[PDB]
Swiss-Prot record:
Coiled coil: none annotated. InterPro entries: AB_hydrolase_fold, FrsA_esterase, PET_hydrolase/cutinase-like. One of its GO terms (cellular component) is periplasmic space. Catalyzes the hydrolysis of cutin, a polyester that forms the structure of plant cuticle. Shows esterase activity towards p-nitrophenol-linked aliphatic esters (pNP-aliphatic esters). Capable of degrading the plastic poly(ethylene terephthalate) (PET), the most abundant polyester plastic in the world. Capable of degrading the bioplastic poly(lactic acid) (PLLA). The keyword Disulfide bond applies. Its EC number is 3.1.1.74, 3.1.1.101. Poly(ethylene terephthalate) binds at residues 60, 131, 155. The active site is at residues 130, 176, 208. It is found in: Secreted; Periplasm. GO terms for molecular function: cutinase activity. This is Cutinase 2. It comes from Thermobifida cellulosilytica. Belongs to the AB hydrolase superfamily. The keyword Disulfide bond applies.
Length: 262
């Protein structure tokens, strides 16, 4: 009885695959054409329906090519996704938060009818790598209307994210030297309220740049999080609770959550 469910019933193998079950088309946004951000690429499922919309920001000196694989993969599970370039490659996290917001507004208002016709504008999510993940936290902390937030190896000088009320999955990299989990990802997760839906997934043997190439674990749990909270799709709770295995032979260095989720 959930009107937001899309696609067949999930399995571990389906979420680890390099494509979800939807064929995908693309629409480009030029730098000049984009107000408030540096342009981007919108990926959308071809199959006629409305879907949640996601904006993804790269990090410092990063371009949309650094998150492109992940944007396309998420879209192939039934989402409209824009991977953005930023106004300049040196923009700081709080600027990237404004550009994430601009990108969502662009998809809803100024993209073509192929895109707008496929977006449920009431179901929006944000993601970002590094300073883009910092921008994800900042925007989520200002925007309780957002349905989900996924900071990937996030970087931010502010360590206190107690005002976030959005369901938030933080992915860290254990060997991160650029945004060390000791002083970024872990304090961020610890400052999120315990009353919200949240999770911390620390990749094993991973550098800061693990999100920038195809990664089955990042893909699987990013999609499961978006399905669970953008679509309210309880078929995906099984992957999040109790979640990935936490050690020898396991998927991840560590996993924490507020399971069970409301
Ligand atoms: Ca622009």
């Amino acid at each position: 009885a959930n009107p937001y469910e899309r696609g067949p019933n999930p399995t571990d193998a389906l979420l680890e695959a390099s494509s979800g079950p939807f064929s995908v088309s693309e629409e480009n946004v030029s730098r000049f054409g984009a107000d408030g951000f540096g342009g981007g690429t919108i990926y959308y499922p071809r199959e006629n329906n409305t879907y949640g919309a996601v904006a993804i920001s790269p990090g410092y000196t990063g371009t949309q090519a650094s998150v492109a694989w992940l944007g396309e993969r998420i879209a192939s599970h039934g989402f409209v996704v824009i991977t953005i370039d930023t106004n300049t490659t040196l923009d700081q996290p709080d600027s990237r938060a404004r550009q994430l917001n601009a990108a969502l507004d662009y998809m809803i208002n100024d993209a073509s009818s192929a895109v707008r016709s496929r977006i449920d504008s009431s179901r929006l999510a944000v993601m970002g790598h590094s300073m883009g993940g910092g921008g994800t936290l900042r925007l989520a902390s200002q925007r309780p209307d957002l349905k989900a937030a996924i900071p990937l190896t996030p970087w931010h000088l502010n360590k206190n994210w107690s005002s976030v009320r959005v369901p938030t999955l933080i992915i860290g990299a254990d060997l991160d030297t650029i945004a060390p989990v000791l002083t970024h990802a872990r304090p961020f997760y610890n400052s999120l309220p315990t009353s919200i839906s949240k999770a911390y997934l620390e990749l094993d043997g991973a550098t800061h740049f693990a999100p920038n190439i195809p990664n089955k674990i990042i893909g699987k749990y990013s999609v499961a999080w978006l399905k669970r909270f953008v679509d309210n799709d309880t078929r995906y709770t099984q992957f999040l609770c109790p979640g990935p295995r936490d050690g020898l032979f396991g998927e991840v260095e560590e996993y924490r959550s507020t399971c069970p989720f409301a």
